[PDB]
């Protein structure tokens, strides 16, 4: 057994009215260093994990697409379009 006598005493008897004021500026400085090392360092890894599948597996993110057919309108010099909904699928393996 470890002789934890002094630590046991510390745990049993601790002040219950002692507190220290914290310099807001230094607290903010440390926290914003933490944010700097999160957004700009771990953000790279997080964004890679989130996006790389969306780059190498794009077809699963855009399920439905549209296709068009066109006809002329000679007497008005216009073009008439008919649309169609399709399931976005692979093509020409």
């Amino acid at each position: 057994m470890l002789d934890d006598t002094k630590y046991i005493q510390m745990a049993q008897k601790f002040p219950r009215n002692v507190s220290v004021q914290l310099n807001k500026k230094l607290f903010v400085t440390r926290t914003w260093f933490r944010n700097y090392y999160f957004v700009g360092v771990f953000g790279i890894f997080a964004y890679f994990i989130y996006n790389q599948p969306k780059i190498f597996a794009p077809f699963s993110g855009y399920p439905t697409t549209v296709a068009y057919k066109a006809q002329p309108d000679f007497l008005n010099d216009q073009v008439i379009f008919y649309s169609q909904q399709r399931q976005n699928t692979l093509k020409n393996f």
Binding site: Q71, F74, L75
Partner: protein, 57 residues
């Protein structure tokens, strides 16, 4: 089953055959679409002139 070379030969030939059938379809459809537009335009002109209908806006 067959070597990959023969499989790609078949793939190319089938692509060509599908394109040929699409060529037939395109030719027939274009011809009949031109005829259809002419007929419909003439029908609307005759209708308006004959007084059968009034086309406004």
């Amino acid at each position: 089953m067959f070597s990959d070379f023969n499989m790609y030969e078949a793939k190319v030939f089938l692509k060509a055959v599908a394109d040929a059938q699409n060529t037939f379809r395109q030719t027939a459809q274009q011809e009949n679409q031109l005829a259809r537009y002419e007929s419909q335009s003439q029908s609307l002109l005759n209708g308006s002139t004959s007084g059968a209908i009034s086309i406004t806006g």
